[PDB]
Symmetry: D2
Subunit: 480 residues, 4 copies
Amino acid sequence: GTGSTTGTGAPAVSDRNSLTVGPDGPILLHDVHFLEQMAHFNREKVPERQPHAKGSGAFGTFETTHDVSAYTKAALFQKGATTEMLARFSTVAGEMGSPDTWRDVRGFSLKFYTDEGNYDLVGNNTPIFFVRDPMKFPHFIRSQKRLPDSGLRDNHMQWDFWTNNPESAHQVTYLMGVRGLPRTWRHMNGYGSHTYMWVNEAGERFWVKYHFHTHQGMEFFTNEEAGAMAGADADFHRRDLFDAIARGEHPAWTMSVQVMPYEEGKTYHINPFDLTKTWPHADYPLIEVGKMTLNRNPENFFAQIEQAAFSPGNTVPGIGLSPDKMLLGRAFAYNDAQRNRIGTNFHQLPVNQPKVPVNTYMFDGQMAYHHSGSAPVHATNSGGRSWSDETGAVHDGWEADGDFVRSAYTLRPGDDDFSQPGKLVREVFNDDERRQLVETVSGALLGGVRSPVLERAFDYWKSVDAEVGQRIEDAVRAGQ
Amino acid sequence: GTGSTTGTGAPAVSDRNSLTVGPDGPILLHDVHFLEQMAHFNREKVPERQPHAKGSGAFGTFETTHDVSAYTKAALFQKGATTEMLARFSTVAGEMGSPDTWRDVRGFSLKFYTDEGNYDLVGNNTPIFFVRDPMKFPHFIRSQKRLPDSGLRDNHMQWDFWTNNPESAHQVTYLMGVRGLPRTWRHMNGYGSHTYMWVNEAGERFWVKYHFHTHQGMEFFTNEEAGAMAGADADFHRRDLFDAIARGEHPAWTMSVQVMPYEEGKTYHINPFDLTKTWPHADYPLIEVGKMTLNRNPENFFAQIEQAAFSPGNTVPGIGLSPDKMLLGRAFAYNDAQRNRIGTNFHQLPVNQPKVPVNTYMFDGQMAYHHSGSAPVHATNSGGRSWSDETGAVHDGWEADGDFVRSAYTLRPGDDDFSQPGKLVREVFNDDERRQLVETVSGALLGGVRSPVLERAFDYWKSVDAEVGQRIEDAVRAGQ
Amino acid sequence: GTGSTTGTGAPAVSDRNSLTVGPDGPILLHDVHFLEQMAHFNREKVPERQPHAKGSGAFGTFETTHDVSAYTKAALFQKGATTEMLARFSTVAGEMGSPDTWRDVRGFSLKFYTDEGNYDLVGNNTPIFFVRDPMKFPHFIRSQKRLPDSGLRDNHMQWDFWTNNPESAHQVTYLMGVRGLPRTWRHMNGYGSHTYMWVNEAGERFWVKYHFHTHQGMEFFTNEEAGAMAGADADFHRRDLFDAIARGEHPAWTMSVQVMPYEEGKTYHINPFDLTKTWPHADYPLIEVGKMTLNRNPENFFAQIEQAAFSPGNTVPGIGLSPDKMLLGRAFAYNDAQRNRIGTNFHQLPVNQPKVPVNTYMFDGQMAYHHSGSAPVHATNSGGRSWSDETGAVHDGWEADGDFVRSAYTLRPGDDDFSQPGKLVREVFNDDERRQLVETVSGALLGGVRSPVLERAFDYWKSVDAEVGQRIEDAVRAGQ
Amino acid sequence: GTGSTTGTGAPAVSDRNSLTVGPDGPILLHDVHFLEQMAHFNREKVPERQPHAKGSGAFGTFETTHDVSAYTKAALFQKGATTEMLARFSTVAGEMGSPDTWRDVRGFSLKFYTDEGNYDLVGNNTPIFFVRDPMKFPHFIRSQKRLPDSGLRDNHMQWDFWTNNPESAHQVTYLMGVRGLPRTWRHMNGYGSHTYMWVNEAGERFWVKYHFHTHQGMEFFTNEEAGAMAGADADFHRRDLFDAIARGEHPAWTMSVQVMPYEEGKTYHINPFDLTKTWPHADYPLIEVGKMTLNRNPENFFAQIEQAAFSPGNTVPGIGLSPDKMLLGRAFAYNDAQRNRIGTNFHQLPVNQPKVPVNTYMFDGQMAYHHSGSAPVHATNSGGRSWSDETGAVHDGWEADGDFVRSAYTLRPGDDDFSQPGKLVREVFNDDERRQLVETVSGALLGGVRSPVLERAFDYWKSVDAEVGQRIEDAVRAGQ
Ligand code: HEM
Ligand code: HEM
């Protein structure tokens, strides 16, 4: 051979010169190698994720160290179970070339390759989110992206959405605090955010929240430092993770759950299924489950990280979803996006395959790498291929009763938009954090927010906390 | 488990009932299994080939039984070489549901999995074709498909194109003869049609034609029988091949070449590179090469036959293309179609992979199943990955000299549109075949061909042969 | 200019000859016109529909001639309303090249371009269907397509599915009767099949069934005649419709509904929402609504018929869906398929556009022809773009109560699999139809159905009717 | 209506709440509006360009102010002709979220909507480029992107490619100089870079180079300032252009050509077709043509800028390509990329349409918005649709003669890799620019370039200029 091949394994002849009529002559159409190489180059790029385009990740293990079999029969969470996993970390709004150290929510997405199928826990570095109904999510995300005429991101539009959707106040307070700028992914926490269901061997159900506490400690950038890093190294977080693992400094997290019995879900004074609400640690203490460690870098970023497909719909026996409407919307959206972003057969790619046998009634489609040979193509066949036919109530379901409506959740006695961020600002933050909050928010509002949105923003922050709100308004008036 | 899985390997729970609020209630959005199954079902279908949508095939072997090393160094054609192969047979114009036994050219497409890469010989059941320049091919194919308003195939349009492009007369005569209706694919011949180049170890070049003679004998349907079969069994040819191989009746062909030394290409009195011309057997006798046998049915029609990608550009050392402009156009077109029909990474699918190592500078793209890990991504790297850099004349090239033109080929003394089909009609056909020709052509012309095309058609057939032409005109006038 | 252009409007120079180095020379890569023409040719074909690939259609009008405002406020069904419409007719199982006159269900899909949006009524030429839960639909359709190894359709697989799913007996009886072979689309009826909801101005709800009775009369082919036509003219139905309209023989149908008050849905002795059940005409008589006439052929089959996108989810005020689980599954599936088959922005294509203004929060995507300029990209904006925010019960909803289950419908006193087809066979069919039924079914069962499916089929037909069942079994034993 | 619609024009009902079973209940599958909105959101993103993903643009006019009819008959370049145009500016290597103010080549891509078709002049802010054969372009671009394992950009890989391809020295010197960091797009020049052909009414041919000189003056950032801006405003250039035009500060450029008669192309002592070479202004002075002004911002960035498709193959009468092999490779590559990035029918999108009538033989394809009705689908039709059939030499062609080779260009007496950048460094740069060059290059080489590439880089810079090379080596050794 000549040192390289075409896609058919024939000699390439040259990777440096095209086929021409004489050394100074024109290129010939039948330079097959040139055409193949250039056409493939022209198709190297694929749609990025929407949202969470900019991200990176690593492989690792999960080890369940404590006994939670009272609450779940899920195989990966039985004491002593070790499971291989993949993690991807990301920002939300920026595109795939955007700086890592912008102020944003960070994704914390996990795929566990369990003995009963792949389980995805697609979390964030925050326990809450901005909105309560998935119909609002495209609107929220577009408000965080670019203006339709100029292609510029816009503070005015962001605050327009947030102030018109005051359910956002809890997450906006968390985001505008110090946790909006994690120094590295190794120095941030992860959360499931939503309530999920755990189901034990007896079929008893629990509402759970997942918490992932970093063993490396929480660390932050200030606004100034993050801005400087965005200019110095747009890939600071990606580099940090890859370099840490490459030198054997394997980051770890402890996973712990809050656990609420099924029946208490009905009566708790805060809506347990409202994604804008945390569960007070005094009412529901953390119960330790196990240890997540990341210890292996990808060998191929594109094939293993870019093409990884996670979905909260990918539950395993012992785990279910919950009445959080946002979670139910996510159950649809992820696979739908992946069929477009990756392809019809994205589940067949190595990173997305489970470690257990698959017998699923999916056939054909573009780029079908795997097939079931001559096996029957339909359930209720007489040809020897099994199918599933469980009837009646599912183990991980609940119940519903009502007219078909488009409505907000029923408010419980403890439910409102501003009490939980008020507590964050007054009781959890210290004085240094309150100072940084005022400097962050006033900075954002001075970045082009106009009337009448600007005045609505003052009122929003005064609703969170009268003092801090007045300080923000003063800093903005001063800066004008 | 429950008898089947999702794509993540988790239990499916049911392949028969959707998740609802009570047994009579509505379906819930978070029925992930339902969504996955239905969305994949919605994407099972892919674009069919254009042309040659309707087809089937089988795997087999090629054994080179004679010594042709005087003419080619190609590994698969060295005496004693055995090579695994794939064949696909097809019609040209009909869509994927169309009857097998319509009058049409049949494709005879071969992929040889050689020790120096995959070699594709994408032939037809005819030694010639309808046009001489690839710019005309889309026009020809559209004339053979459906009218733009009604969606109906139309004899008028077909004859409009053919009579305006009298270069078509040779192939149209072959097609309207008995060979237009092969009884099965096992009972038809195959040809390369084009002149190809063979190159021996010393670098001497030959112009070759490939011929594949059926060991089962030539057999035909009449117009009436083929029409009846189109109604009784639209998949007659596909069934015939699959059933023959399944009962151990393995079809075979002998491959033989005509061989013309490079220099004789310049002086031969017929243009050797004109796809509308055969080479007289008296001037260039057949030289036997080897035996093609098909002996294994596909295990999965979609994955192995529907997704097979052949290209005449897929040559191997010892074989090249030729000055036939049609062949040079094909070198571009096939891979271009496959990137759309199958996907960017179609070369990675099992049926399309070679049996030899691949080191090619293609990266990423949608549905990338295989990757080169951390290997260098560019040629002239210092990272240990080889590349190709042969300079100067390629072993399988020729030469050119001229202004850039859009022009017909230079006519040689023996070149014209009507002499070779005249000989077919007068000397090769017997009286029974001439009778069937007249009944075929008059039938086609009575199927809706209008003035002024109808009169041009009479003249076309009189140009092929004055007598037969007059008989066709009489049969049409009688039928009117 | 030269007589034609490139896609940029520059002169094409030639549509007949490629750019070469001299008249006998090779083709140059920079023949842009050749590349553009050939690459577009290579992408002319698109995925066909699954199912209902083979079809055609026409434009027309709907005129509401009677007063049904007591039952619906829908604008197109107010007395005197005329609405432009599109109809597409089709078979179910065959691919886009398959003969029109195969035994099959026919689609009867209508799009009404109303003053309150496009309303699609995607019906069939039958009032019932084969299965009751949409999870079974992909399985059913695959059983009606091709075997995975050979690519052949298979009676064994079809009867395997049907006999394992005896809910199918009503539709299988209708299909195997004379209506399985309509002579033309103009000579067949259409039905909504499902129960839909109508809602009047006061907000009172009715369950309705749609019926479309041909003004041309019902006409059929026998098995023998349909088979012969499949061989003589694979496009017989398409040609028939196009030619009828072209000569001014405009086909018409009368639309009439059956109307059941909301509350009677709860108590009727047959499940009104079971797609395998008709509503007896004695209990619910037909109420005339209006006249459908088709009076205009497409000008471009591909652009107007092939790219037409219908969805039962496309309701308009005054019309809703129903507790039929099959209908709820369809509400998801059609748009999902269309995003793949046509594209992200299929709703922007002319045939799919409404005749009323659109203000929808959809942005960007591949091939975005229309855009909203600089308008706000999110709801709850302060930028002057309106959004929708109706809260509470929707006018076209119902109610549900229960645990989350995967279960069959609750059987009502009149519900079973075999009573309605029994009545069809014994009371509706005459002796000639019973004879044709026995000859149809025995023919199908002799076409390769094997034990143990063949014996299950005898029992199935005996369950429909003991006599006819015994006659089928005798005809099969005789034919063996 | 309710304030907004679905894609069918029916009322949306809500853009804020999904359809659920009671206010606290689960989401129903048949929430069509939710599905449509979310599925479209999931498909908003498309593949970015490769390269030149990050960019923006504006509309304007071109006015030809001088008489160049002695050299070209092209309609847009006749004296007094005004033409609407679109410009897009971009970086090369970064993705769509990447900072505008990275060191890079800038694209300067123009589309002129002329009276004889759309003419694209796809230039850069440099008159030269890095490589001479298009086979090397994918390799070059990948060396400028990310490592395959870590996903990080890498100086080592960049210098590995450049030092192994010393033809790169001219452009690398230009890029590492002050012009690598334009302060805004309004303050940079544009060039065609390649030699193009101009053809006058008599058919006489000229080799031309295009030059676009900014009326705003050349302005730069230092390394430090550009880095700071990357952190402060990743969209600085996009914002600058949009804001300038919005306040009526319309940027302008003067276009001038260098003009070489056809015959001098053969004998000039520098290869006129080598993309790494400029033509000395003393030998070929600039001849003024006209004025480019940008005076209108996009109304929709996605629809008008993101989906704009430019190709150097889009020539118009009076303009042709040239023997630059890089240009001939580009003639293929752009449309090929656009069929994937945008779609089969990208030429139909408003921004890509010409202002003149189109009669082109392209049909169907996904998302076909425009069609030719019932018009004939093939050239040489008797149906009244014209086609093109010019034969013989094309007006904008040249000639070739030789064997088929893969070879570098023949070196002319003045040709080498290092003389032109030597002159740039010694004669054009001043002392301040030489200082910045040394600080730029040493900075790049200290950013992770390893042996043996680092030593090859010292030699490369010493080949450009012995002194400056020694200064770079000293700065690197000092920094180590
Ligand atoms: C209704 C609300 C939401 C919708 C509709 C939604 C939808 C999406 C979609 C479509 C993607 C891209 C998927 C792909 O292309 O592979 C995505 C990614 C992601 N989402 Fe969500 N999302 C929602 C809320 C949330 C919440 C609440 C969290 C965290 C608790 C979250 C965390 C993420 C993460 C981490 C990713 C990136 C996953 C990865 O690394 O590939 N999202 N989301
Ligand atoms: C310039 C003329 C021609 C052009 C542009 C052309 C182009 C094409 C294209 C684009 C396909 C579909 C490829 C795919 O989707 O995989 C095809 C298939 C095919 N062509 Fe050609 N073709 C030409 C002439 C011919 C000739 C002369 C022959 C035979 C000697 C031939 C034999 C076939 C066969 C057998 C197939 C089907 C291959 C298979 O089974 O997959 N074509 N052609």
